[PDB]
Automatic annotation (TrEMBL), chain B:
Species for this entry: Plasmodium falciparum (isolate 3D7)
Any Pfam family matching the protein: Ribosomal_L21e
Keyword Methyltransferase: no
Any one Gene Ontology molecular-function term assigned to this protein's record: structural constituent of ribosome
Protein name according to UniProt: 60S ribosomal protein L21
TrEMBL record, chain C:
Region: Disordered, residue numbers: 1-35
Protein name per Swiss-Prot or TrEMBL: 60S ribosomal protein L29
Keywords: Ribonucleoprotein, Ribosomal protein
Keyword Ribosomal protein in record: yes
Domain of life: Eukaryota
Residue ranges of the TM segments: none
Entry's Gene Ontology cellular component terms: cytosolic large ribosomal subunit
Any GO BP: cytoplasmic translation
Organism: Plasmodium falciparum (isolate 3D7)
Length: 96, 156, 66
RNA sequence: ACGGACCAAGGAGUCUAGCAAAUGUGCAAGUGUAUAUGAUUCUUUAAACAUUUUAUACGCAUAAUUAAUGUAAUAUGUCCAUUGUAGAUUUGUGGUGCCCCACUUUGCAUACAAUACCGGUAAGCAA
RNA sequence: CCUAUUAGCUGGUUAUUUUCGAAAGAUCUCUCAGGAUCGCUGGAGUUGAUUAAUAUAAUUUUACCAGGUAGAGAUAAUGAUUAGAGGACAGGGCCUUGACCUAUUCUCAAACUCCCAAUAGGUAAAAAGGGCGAAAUAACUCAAUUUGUAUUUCACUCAUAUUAAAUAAAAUAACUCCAAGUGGGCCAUUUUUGGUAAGCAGAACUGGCGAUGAGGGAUGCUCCUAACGCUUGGAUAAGGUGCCUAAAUAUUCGCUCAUGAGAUCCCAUAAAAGGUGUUGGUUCAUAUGAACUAGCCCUGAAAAUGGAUGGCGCUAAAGCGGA
RNA sequence: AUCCGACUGUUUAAUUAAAACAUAGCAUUGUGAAAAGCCACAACUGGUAUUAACACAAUGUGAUUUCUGCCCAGUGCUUUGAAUGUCAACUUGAUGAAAUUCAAUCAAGCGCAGGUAAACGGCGGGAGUAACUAUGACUCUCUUAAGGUAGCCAAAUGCCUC
RNA sequence: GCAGAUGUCCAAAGACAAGCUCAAAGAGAACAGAAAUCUCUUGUAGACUAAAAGGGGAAAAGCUUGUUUGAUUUCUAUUUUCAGAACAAGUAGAAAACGUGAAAGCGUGGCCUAUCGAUCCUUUAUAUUUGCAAAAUGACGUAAAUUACUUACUACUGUGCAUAUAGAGGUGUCUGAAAAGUUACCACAGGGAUAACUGGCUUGUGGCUGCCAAGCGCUCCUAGCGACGUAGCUUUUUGAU
RNA sequence: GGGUAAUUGGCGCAGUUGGUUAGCGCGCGGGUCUCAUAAUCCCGAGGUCGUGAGUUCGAUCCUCACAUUACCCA
RNA sequence: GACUCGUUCAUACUACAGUGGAUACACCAGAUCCCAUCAGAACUCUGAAGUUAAGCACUGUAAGGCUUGGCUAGUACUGAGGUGGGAGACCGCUCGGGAACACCAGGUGAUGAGUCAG
């Protein structure tokens, strides 16, 4: 799968028209230490009881979905669009 | 594993007949349909849009919705102790004006004039159809020369 | 250890115990998702008809009492 | 295939909490006198009787919807009580025997739909 | 002592008559000896019909629709497959052979098809409707303030007492509520998969057994007749009429003799191959030869306690095929 | 005459008295002390210990005779350390209004570099070739950390096997 | 049971329009021959269309060109499996903004039938929509007024956290627990719903008995045998259930 | 997922020191003399894990491999 | 006598032959301009010297195919009943339904709306 880095398409934020967008790949981002769930888990793990929550081990998949990140160039607002799961994926390459 | 897909078991049902392949005729697109008409569902496999499901091939229903190139049909279907109404949405190439109703219409149009005349001359006529029944006696004339005698055949 | 795994013996005997039921054959159905731009117009038509009918009814109630 | 040598006595779907459906009873936009207090109540009575000398204890119901700040059911032209199809009962004529028919009058309950309005969300416009 | 700990698993669970009456399928499940959920059952209550009507129907008729199974085909396509015939790349030196082509020829297919049944399915057969003519509303549609299309009114008119084809102890109907038990099945005729087969394993449509007794099959959960309040008479079904055992040693035609006869659904075993036993029939040869055919009988035909047309027995049948 | 155990000794009270256990002999390991080795205790304190390497503690094998081969790649145990990668709390700085956020620093352990088999254990295939056949001293070739040595055998250890 | 396939692949192999016609065969042309390039004649698809198999396709759904990003944002009526519950995969439409084409039209991924995932938690996006429990934080902003606790106006107001709505990170035992062995020292509740004997149905395998006649028997089918085939019996083998 | 190191010629290694941006031993081909071997001296070729900079480089996020130690709520 | 737009989608297709030219449909004469190629072959644009040679229309052929009827044949199969026959494998009877190849014969079209010419 090869995808170009720019794309003219419909904008759904602040200008309901076709304009020019930029295309990249979305990344997960790191879990932050002060979120409510992580504080709950960290307080539960203290004391004298061993592990308190499940830990997954039966991995089966070998790919991930490839959600794209668009961004209007007139207004600077951003939107997500998802694709089908694949193995190799390039953002801007040589044509066939 | 079991294989219950959408088009399973349609090898002979969904294929064109002999020396009759090709897409539909131009007059197919001039048919007139209204709300409440009777209609037949016959799948045409040369058009892959608006394809009806396997079961509803060869069934008859009534129209409840008309669109640009589609028709909604009300069809009965039996489910294990009851009959459920289904709403089938197909494209216009898989739709045919039903012919199951024509005897009723011809009968009404024809009997109207008979009633009009009968009341005109103050008469008592019957218009209900008649079951076929027994025959009256007749005298059948045949010369003795035309009767032929037959008997069982010997085995060879 | 092994047992039966499918049959439909007896099934339509139970089915015909309480007959094969039919749909109820109502007079009107709901035009909720059906053809727009044709039923909105029908709403306008029926509003006009109702306005005329009620204007006549009010008028008659106005004369009859003098 | 397992239990049973014989006889008499004993021997197993109950009680409490909390919810619902069904049915009987009382009152009804309300209903239930809580804990207490009162009395010429006091063998029975640990029962029964009473309620503080334009009248704010509390529960359930009388209004919904939204995470939420909150907002909240035709609308003043008429105390009137949205619209249609079928339909119980009533009103006026005729037909065959108070009953059933053909018109006429009214239109419960309910079934199928339409419309208006209230809370949330989209869309359009926005001090 | 906590403690009468817990058990999806064994065992038990106490008066009468009367009325209705099942499931052993299906979806999900750390699910396969369990459970929830739908289906099948009981009770309660309204709305209807009581007008030989309408609603209605495991049924027909009339009109119309969809199909690729039994059969068929091989010269029509695909894939298999035997043999000659007739024609214009190799073969030693204008002929082997196999080629290539053109008409034929013997034989085939769950996963082949030019064609194509019988059974089995689906829609329709008139009044809350149909037909016809005028108007009124619309922000829809159209080149159209009439182009059309829905709706709203008004006028006219469509069989009915025989009921828009037949038949109907068709309203014993329709709907809502609250709940029980069940979720190991098996068997028979017909179709049918694996297996050499099996009282084996797995499916389909009906009817049964389970949950059910009475007459018959000697005997027997499933075969035949037939389903059940207490009686008195009458006349039968399925099967029987020599005795056991109620009723014919009945009548009227043929066949059979067995030094291991035979005696009827399920059902309780028998074959290939032979006979100069006897009874009928069909052909070829100067009233004699030959070939063939099919009825009863006989040979093929060997197991363990003493035994089984149910027993006795039965041959001018009490055996087999008819009336 | 063969097999096992060297011998006297011990054992499953009530189905096994033995080839099983112990034993003398042999070998290996830890420890110079009240801040040590090995072990007990909740703490405070104890056992060996009225002891001191000819000692105390932890294991294998099992009289005498004759012997005790090769392998440190795997898993254990063990030795060296600021040249050295990773690896906590604390501490120290930077920024910020502050909570946070970020960066640095010689702990032990692993890694890096060595020892050790009377530690756990382990210890190969295919072809050709000698004047009748047969065999293969000899040769070629894959290949391991090392390729079963001295001995012994159809053995209480060999399927085929009577 | 039978013969197989799936956990992928594609900025084009997605969209639209135009022009064109494929496999193969025959006969001809310098090197050139069985196979190189070129001309003609026949050609109903014998080619091609990502991947199993089935269906479809000839001024096209195939080949080549030109322009593109409808593989886009929001909502409904519904089909398949079915309890007529969720996912998932489809069909018919409506409100926006676009592409292609002269135009009618066509386009909400791949000519159709497979190619996939709950609660809780985390992560990035959107908003003139909200909260952090007695209050304030843009800002004393603008206009007045004074002898200050003066007055009237304002969509847009600290860090951090929470919350609504939309994608994503995964459960293949795929309606979704965080999980290694041994018992020849053994325990309990049960099961003939289920194995290790006899008995019962079957008789493949084991054992025994037949039919036909190529041939063996110097010569001679049948004294004694009997190839290639073919019909049975038994329950002193072993299987199957 | 975190930290560190390294990837350059036929092999093995230096350059990471921006206004010079590429080097050496084994190699490879020709003379030198080597009782038939030998220290041998001149030369010719041989390239930076991949895409963009307030720039003249080896200076940036990321991405593919390799090694070591350590981490784990869908 | 001809033409344009359609319907049926082979009785309309295929091979080989014979006949025809008022108008009309074609073949045809050219490349400046719109346009198009390696190539004015095709496509596009401008014409009016020549011809029925071909396209096209109408006919023929013990023509192939297609299409309708007869026959194959109450044959092959099959719904219901049977205390029917037979060791079986299989096969009749009662009440019902009913094919396909092959072979023989006849045919080779018909039609809607509008227009031109003598
Ligand atoms: Mg189908
Ligand atoms: Mg028991
Ligand atoms: Mg007992
Ligand atoms: Mg109540
Ligand atoms: Mg409360
Ligand atoms: Mg408001
Ligand atoms: Mg303003
Ligand atoms: Mg107990
Ligand atoms: Mg009953
Ligand atoms: Mg055949
Ligand atoms: Mg059970
Ligand atoms: Mg019975
Ligand atoms: Mg018997
Ligand atoms: Mg009697
Ligand atoms: Mg008898
Ligand atoms: Mg008697
Ligand atoms: Mg003789
Ligand atoms: Mg008798
Ligand atoms: Mg001893
Ligand atoms: Mg010794
Ligand atoms: Mg002793
Ligand atoms: Mg003992
Ligand atoms: Mg002893
Ligand atoms: Mg010992
Ligand atoms: Mg010792
Ligand atoms: Mg080591
Ligand atoms: Mg260290
Ligand atoms: Mg040796
Ligand atoms: Mg040996
Ligand atoms: Mg095709
Ligand atoms: Mg095209
Ligand atoms: Mg395509
Ligand atoms: Mg599971
Ligand atoms: Mg599951
Ligand atoms: Mg264990
Ligand atoms: Mg059993
Ligand atoms: Mg046998
Ligand atoms: Mg000519
Ligand atoms: Mg012909
Ligand atoms: Zn924008």
């Amino acid at each position: 799968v090869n995808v170009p880095k720019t794309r003219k398409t419909y904008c759904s934020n602040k200008c309901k028209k076709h304009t020019m967008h930029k295309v990249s790949q979305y990344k997960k981002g790191k879990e932050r230490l002060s979120s409510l769930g992580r504080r709950r888990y960290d307080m539960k793990q203290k004391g004298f009881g061993g592990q308190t929550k499940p830990v997954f081990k039966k991995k089966a998949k070998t790919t991930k979905k490839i959600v794209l990140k668009l961004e209007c160039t007139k207004c600077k607002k951003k939107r997500f669009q998802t694709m089908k799961r694949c193995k190799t994926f390039e953002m801007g390459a040589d044509k066939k | 594993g079991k294989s219950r897909g959408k088009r399973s078991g349609t090898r002979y049902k969904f294929s064109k007949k002999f020396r009759k392949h090709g897409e539909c005729t131009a007059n197919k697109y001039l048919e007139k349909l209204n709300y409440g008409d009777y209609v037949d569902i016959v799948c045409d496999s040369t058009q892959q849009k608006g394809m009806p499901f396997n079961y509803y091939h060869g069934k008859t229903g009534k129209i409840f919705h008309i669109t640009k190139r589609g028709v909604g049909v009300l069809v009965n279907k039996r489910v294990k102790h009851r009959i459920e109404q289904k709403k089938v949405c197909v494209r216009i190439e898989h739709v045919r004006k039903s012919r199951c109703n024509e005897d009723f219409l011809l009968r009404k149009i024809k009997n109207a004039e008979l009633i009009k005349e009968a009341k005109l001359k103050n008469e008592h006529i019957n218009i209900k159809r008649k079951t076929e029944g027994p025959k009256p006696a007749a005298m059948i004339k045949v010369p003795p020369s035309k009767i032929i005698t037959i008997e069982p055949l010997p085995f060879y | 250890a092994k047992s039966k795994n499918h049959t439909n013996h007896n099934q339509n005997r139970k089915a015909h115990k309480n007959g094969i039921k039919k749909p109820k054959k109502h007079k009107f159905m709901s035009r909720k998702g059906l053809d727009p731009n044709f039923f909105r117009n029908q709403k306008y038509c029926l509003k006009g008809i109702q306005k005329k009918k009620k204007e006549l009814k009010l008028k008659a109630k106005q004369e009859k009492n003098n």
